[PDB]
Design an enzyme around this catalytic site. Structure first.
Site, mmCIF file in Angstrom:
data_model
loop_
_atom_site.group_PDB
_atom_site.id
_atom_site.type_symbol
_atom_site.label_atom_id
_atom_site.label_comp_id
_atom_site.label_asym_id
_atom_site.label_seq_id
_atom_site.Cartn_x
_atom_site.Cartn_y
_atom_site.Cartn_z
ATOM 1 N N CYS A 107 0.812 -1.220 0.000
ATOM 2 C CA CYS A 107 0.000 0.000 0.000
ATOM 3 C C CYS A 107 0.850 1.277 0.000
ATOM 4 C CB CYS A 107 -0.941 0.018 1.211
ATOM 5 S SG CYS A 107 -2.109 1.393 1.228
ATOM 6 N N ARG A 110 -0.211 4.629 2.729
ATOM 7 C CA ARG A 110 -0.045 4.420 4.161
ATOM 8 C C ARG A 110 0.245 5.630 5.032
ATOM 9 N NH1 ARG A 110 4.053 -0.365 4.768
ATOM 10 N NH2 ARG A 110 4.475 -0.035 2.540
ATOM 11 N N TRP A 279 -9.138 5.586 -0.857
ATOM 12 C CA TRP A 279 -9.489 6.271 -2.086
ATOM 13 C C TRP A 279 -8.491 5.936 -3.190
ATOM 14 C CZ3 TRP A 279 -8.737 9.652 2.339
ATOM 15 C CH2 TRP A 279 -7.454 10.236 2.412
ATOM 16 N N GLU A 284 -4.750 3.649 -10.952
ATOM 17 C CA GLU A 284 -5.495 2.406 -10.828
ATOM 18 C C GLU A 284 -6.590 2.366 -11.883
ATOM 19 O OE1 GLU A 284 -5.816 3.184 -6.234
ATOM 20 O OE2 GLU A 284 -6.229 1.057 -6.587
HETATM 21 C C1 HEM Z 1 -6.195 6.550 1.785
HETATM 22 C C2 HEM Z 1 -6.184 6.054 0.518
HETATM 23 C C3 HEM Z 1 -5.398 4.980 0.062
HETATM 24 C C4 HEM Z 1 -4.742 4.956 -1.107
HETATM 25 C C5 HEM Z 1 -4.582 6.170 -2.021
HETATM 26 C C6 HEM Z 1 -4.202 3.622 -1.284
HETATM 27 C C7 HEM Z 1 -3.579 3.166 -2.455
HETATM 28 C C8 HEM Z 1 -3.239 1.841 -2.711
HETATM 29 C C9 HEM Z 1 -2.796 1.342 -3.995
HETATM 30 C C10 HEM Z 1 -2.400 2.104 -5.239
HETATM 31 C C11 HEM Z 1 -2.689 0.005 -3.846
HETATM 32 C C12 HEM Z 1 -2.417 -0.998 -4.942
HETATM 33 C C13 HEM Z 1 -3.742 -1.330 -5.601
HETATM 34 C C14 HEM Z 1 -3.570 -2.277 -6.755
HETATM 35 O O1 HEM Z 1 -2.691 -2.007 -7.600
HETATM 36 O O2 HEM Z 1 -4.307 -3.279 -6.823
HETATM 37 C C15 HEM Z 1 -2.981 -0.339 -2.477
HETATM 38 C C16 HEM Z 1 -2.882 -1.624 -1.957
HETATM 39 C C17 HEM Z 1 -3.265 -1.961 -0.653
HETATM 40 N N1 HEM Z 1 -3.812 -1.072 0.274
HETATM 41 FE FE1 HEM Z 1 -3.988 0.895 0.129
HETATM 42 N N2 HEM Z 1 -4.495 2.815 -0.202
HETATM 43 C C18 HEM Z 1 -5.258 3.646 0.620
HETATM 44 C C19 HEM Z 1 -5.966 3.194 1.741
HETATM 45 C C20 HEM Z 1 -5.971 1.916 2.224
HETATM 46 C C21 HEM Z 1 -6.739 1.513 3.388
HETATM 47 C C22 HEM Z 1 -7.694 2.350 4.222
HETATM 48 C C23 HEM Z 1 -6.437 0.213 3.628
HETATM 49 C C24 HEM Z 1 -6.944 -0.599 4.675
HETATM 50 C C25 HEM Z 1 -7.151 -0.222 5.971
HETATM 51 C C26 HEM Z 1 -5.499 -0.165 2.566
HETATM 52 C C27 HEM Z 1 -4.926 -1.429 2.443
HETATM 53 C C28 HEM Z 1 -4.120 -1.865 1.369
HETATM 54 C C29 HEM Z 1 -3.691 -3.225 1.166
HETATM 55 C C30 HEM Z 1 -4.027 -4.411 2.040
HETATM 56 C C31 HEM Z 1 -3.136 -3.276 -0.076
HETATM 57 C C32 HEM Z 1 -2.568 -4.480 -0.817
HETATM 58 C C33 HEM Z 1 -3.668 -5.358 -1.377
HETATM 59 C C34 HEM Z 1 -3.125 -6.438 -2.276
HETATM 60 O O3 HEM Z 1 -2.126 -7.084 -1.892
HETATM 61 O O4 HEM Z 1 -3.702 -6.647 -3.365
HETATM 62 N N3 HEM Z 1 -5.225 0.880 1.699
HETATM 63 N N4 HEM Z 1 -3.372 0.794 -1.762
HETATM 64 N N1 LIG Z 2 -6.870 2.331 -3.274
HETATM 65 C C1 LIG Z 2 -7.217 1.118 -3.018
HETATM 66 N N2 LIG Z 2 -7.111 0.246 -3.999
HETATM 67 C C2 LIG Z 2 -7.451 -1.188 -3.927
HETATM 68 C C3 LIG Z 2 -7.328 -1.737 -5.340
HETATM 69 C C4 LIG Z 2 -7.810 -3.184 -5.448
HETATM 70 C C5 LIG Z 2 -7.633 -3.723 -6.865
HETATM 71 N N3 LIG Z 2 -8.464 -2.917 -7.756
HETATM 72 C C6 LIG Z 2 -8.002 -5.201 -6.982
HETATM 73 O O1 LIG Z 2 -8.888 -5.569 -7.752
HETATM 74 N N4 LIG Z 2 -7.310 -6.048 -6.228
HETATM 75 C C7 LIG Z 2 -7.542 -7.492 -6.257
HETATM 76 C C8 LIG Z 2 -6.167 -8.176 -6.080
HETATM 77 C C9 LIG Z 2 -5.319 -8.034 -7.371
HETATM 78 N N5 LIG Z 2 -4.008 -8.689 -7.221
HETATM 79 C C10 LIG Z 2 -8.610 -7.952 -5.242
HETATM 80 N N6 LIG Z 2 -8.895 -9.259 -5.247
HETATM 81 O O2 LIG Z 2 -9.184 -7.161 -4.495
HETATM 82 N N7 LIG Z 2 -7.644 0.767 -1.873
HETATM 83 N N8 LIG Z 2 -8.167 1.598 -0.903
HETATM 84 O O3 LIG Z 2 -8.506 1.128 0.148
HETATM 85 O O4 LIG Z 2 -8.290 2.793 -1.090
#
Ligand code: HEM
Ligand SMILES: N=C(NCCC[C@H](N)C(=O)N[C@@H](CCN)C(N)=O)N[N+](=O)[O-]
Ligand code: HEM
Ligand SMILES: N=C(NCCC[C@H](N)C(=O)N[C@@H](CCN)C(N)=O)N[N+](=O)[O-]
Ligand SMILES: C[C@H](O)[C@H](O)[C@H]1CNc2nc(N)[nH]c(=O)c2N1
Ligand SMILES: C[C@H](O)[C@H](O)[C@H]1CNc2nc(N)[nH]c(=O)c2N1
Ligand SMILES: C[As](C)(=O)[O-]
Ligand SMILES: C[As](C)(=O)[O-]
Ligand SMILES: [Zn+2]
EC number: 1.14.13.39
Lengths: 403, 404
Positions: A107, A110, A279, A284
């Protein structure tokens, strides 16, 4: 032991000592690195994970070693020895949820980790109840385009009993309908889930952006279908700031990203259903979802629209097309007053986070391949930053699809 | 299923298993506790086994493993190492080893060409002046007036006690980097130190933004001698944009030949401290890294201003827009000047083809994801969607300490 982490743009150097706190193994070995792969190929145990987490909790409130800490440790001990498990106090669940996010190596958002709205839905006992909780999460998280980071935590997993699960990968997704010639109408990544809904009774649509219904599953019960209230799902029509013809493509994307298929682990307890949302980072949508060859793959359409020489690679029609598409996303969301962060602003914030974390915990787990945006990698500061990736707990993990 | 790393391509959904990784005999920087994959820089008995391994590799490549010639060459190597401490490679063995090192390079996206490499043996070279002659011959042949040809010149191997043959420069061709009074840098910031060494060694420095550096060549136990490359040999390409008529006025230029020269070529235990190799560029090396890196020429802002972009806000993607035009300009000027180059789209597509070839041939291909995926438009190229296993195979190219 302790790795020397270097930034090649600034020449700065740090040492990651936080990795020594990793109790769980990754996929790499001295013989070969598998860091680019997406997925990962007893009272004594649980009790140690539990104690560790309770320790982490009291340190966070700086009352480590106090009476409250000793008592809470005996409570966990007592419960596990007697029932083989235990439960988290609401404040502990709040702390753990934020830690899991903070330790998410993949992420890039963070820096926000400390601002997380935690909804305790552990007193849930039916898909219908899950649905109300999910609908509230959405209303709150969406907040009229002014998104707010939130997570809703459902009942933990229990020995013998089946898991509570949200079958969709995200709370909001567009359908993917396999048509006559193997082609797909809608989002190709959601073909399977779109069919599972139909198989369970959903009346499918026939558009490119039909928002799917949620399949919620309560323990040992076939999943139930629920349709999300159209007014709860905010969407943004994509139009370009100068290319008046872009809008004609009728492209649009929902405003809320909310992973619902990941498992949340805290002190050894596993929460099979805990959807979270923050968000979008503009890439993405503009890059991965709209331009991946196996997604909406609209790269060529926009290219022909811009009247580019799609006759040869060296003309960079693809790169030019991608940039406008990302600009179109940023513009639209900004126009609809919906929260969104471009990959420059986003990576800039991550760097501060890396610095904040360096001083706070002596390091920060990060997955380079994921932290670096899909377009313009080296133009962002993270590209030039070495990173160490290891598994910390509390943690968000992948889990098998429930079917 | 198979007890080898499972590898998936998320675009096509296809799977493969890497069994080639089983052949690696050197640990990497990772461990089950933490991945250091993103880090740039992470005994007669020992030499004997390394050599035996190589010889076996050689005979396998010619389909004579187990034969008499094979068993005799093995005998010969032991005999030699036994009474001298080291041994020597045969002509055909050097040519095979040099190609395998290129072939085994985890960070090279151009490996589909590994088979067509011109190996210039120069193990007879005995002076710094002769080193210069060899190098000039390399450049002349490799440049081939714009129709570049892959090549490598191998100098004498490290010898017991005796000093190494070393090329001090990082590449045979590089631009000067002059530290200014006000603190900034004129030219390429990356080469500030070597420029200072060329001066501490008698070079009369220029003061341009693109001054080709002289070579500091070093023969065994002798201080480095300074050789200036004849301008007629160093081909350069003036950069101009296909539609932005004003880009040519920026005066940007780049040389045609990329020639790494500070890498150590290791074959069967033998170490070739000096062994410059060259191929041709991938447009993003020039247009994105060299010209747009913050710590390099850093021309992003300048170009953005010329395109009249809003550089006040990130969300305008002014950086992305400029980087694209600059890259196109590198592609356009090279094509114009009939100089060999490959864009990141063609390059990556050909690498996918390479992965497929190596799957059938060796059961895998060691690759460094962070280095294979291009600096711009990453997910727009197929490699981004390709998982990769990374490990060290031998022979190989390795980084080595600076001679000074
Ligand atoms: C505040 C806004 C946030 C932004 C802009 C952000 C952005 C991102 C982005 C760009 C990714 C990669 C998404 C992808 O390519 O599939 C990601 C992955 C992730 N984010 Fe964040 N994030 C945010 C908030 C959060 C929140 C609130 C949580 C949970 C409490 C979170 C948990 C994670 C986790 C678990 C991953 C990895 C998921 C995976 O392995 O597929 N994110 N985030
Ligand atoms: N920005 C976020 N992005 C989450 C992006 C999830 C992504 N579009 C997706 O489809 N991830 C697959 C995992 C892809 N390796 C899944 N199963 O949720 N998350 N957020 O909390 O703000
Ligand atoms: C035929 C054209 C070739 C192309 C297009 C090509 C392209 C590339 C690219 C884009 C890089 C990364 C450059 C960087 O970011 O610093 C690279 C690295 C590398 N290439 Fe190739 N290459 C070619 C020929 C060669 C040849 C002839 C050899 C050796 C015989 C070679 C050996 C390597 C090695 C060892 C690396 C990594 C060096 C390091 O770690 O800095 N390449 N190549
Ligand atoms: N295209 C090539 N590019 C070589 C890239 C060299 C890069 N510009 C560079 O400066 N590399 C550093 C190594 C950085 N790890 C060096 N010391 O030579 N190679 N070729 O043979 O075709
Ligand atoms: C194979 C490779 O690991 C895979 O395509 C990764 C690369 N980087 C990524 N980065 C982000 N943010 N999201 C992804 O899904 C991926 N996919
Ligand atoms: C820190 C990170 O390892 C570093 O910036 C790497 C990333 N990928 C790269 N890839 C290539 N081809 N060349 C480089 O110099 C780098 N630099
Ligand atoms: C919009 As179409 C050309
Ligand atoms: C276009 As120039 C200043
Ligand atoms: Zn690794």
């Amino acid at each position: 032991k302790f790795p020397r982490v270097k930034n090649w743009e600034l020449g700065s150097i740090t040492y990651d000592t936080l990795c020594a706190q990793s109790q769980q193994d990754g996929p790499c070995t001295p013989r070969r690195c598998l860091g680019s792969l997406v997925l990962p190929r007893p009272a004594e145990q649980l009790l140690s994970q539990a104690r560790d987490f309770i320790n982490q909790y009291y340190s966070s409130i700086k009352r480590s070693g106090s009476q409250a800490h000793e008592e809470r440790l005996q409570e966990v001990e007592a419960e596990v020895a007697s029932t083989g498990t235990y439960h988290l106090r609401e404040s502990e669940l709040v702390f753990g949820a934020k830690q899991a996010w903070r330790n998410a190596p993949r992420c890039v958002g963070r820096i926000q980790w400390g601002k997380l709205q935690v909804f305790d839905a552990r007193d849930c006992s039916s898909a219908q109840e899950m649905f109300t909780y999910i609908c509230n999460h959405i209303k709150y998280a969406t907040n009229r385009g002014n998104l707010r980071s939130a997570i809703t935590v459902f009942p933990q997993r229990a020995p013998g009993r089946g898991d509570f699960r949200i079958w969709n990968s995200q709370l909001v997704r567009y359908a993917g309908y396999r048509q006559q010639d193997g082609s797909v109408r809608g989002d190709p990544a959601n073909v399977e889930i779109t069919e599972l809904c139909i198989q369970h009774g959903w009346t499918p649509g026939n558009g490119r952006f039909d928002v799917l219904p949620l399949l919620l599953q309560a323990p040992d019960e076939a999943p139930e279908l629920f349709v999300l209230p159209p007014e709860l799902v905010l969407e943004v029509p994509l139009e370009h700031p100068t290319l008046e013809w872009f809008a004609a493509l009728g492209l649009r994307w929902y405003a809320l990203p909310a992973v619902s298929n990941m498992l949340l682990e805290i002190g050894g307890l596993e929460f099979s259903a805990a959807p979270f949302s923050g968000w979008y980072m503009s890439t993405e949508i503009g890059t991965r979802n709209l331009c991946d060859p196996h997604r909406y793959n609209i790269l060529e359409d926009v290219a022909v629209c811009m009247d580019l020489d799609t006759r040869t690679t060296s003309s960079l029609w693809k790169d030019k097309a991608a940039v406008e598409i990302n600009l179109a996303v940023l513009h639209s969301f900004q126009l609809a007053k919906v929260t969104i962060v471009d990959h420059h602003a986003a990576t800039v914030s991550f760097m501060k986070h890396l610095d904040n974390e360096q001083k706070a915990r002596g390091g920060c787990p990060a997955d380079w391949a994921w932290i670096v945006p899909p377009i313009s990698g080296s133009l962002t500061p993270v590209f030039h930053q070495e990173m160490v990736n290891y598994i910390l707990s509390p943690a968000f993990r992948y889990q098998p699809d429930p079917w």
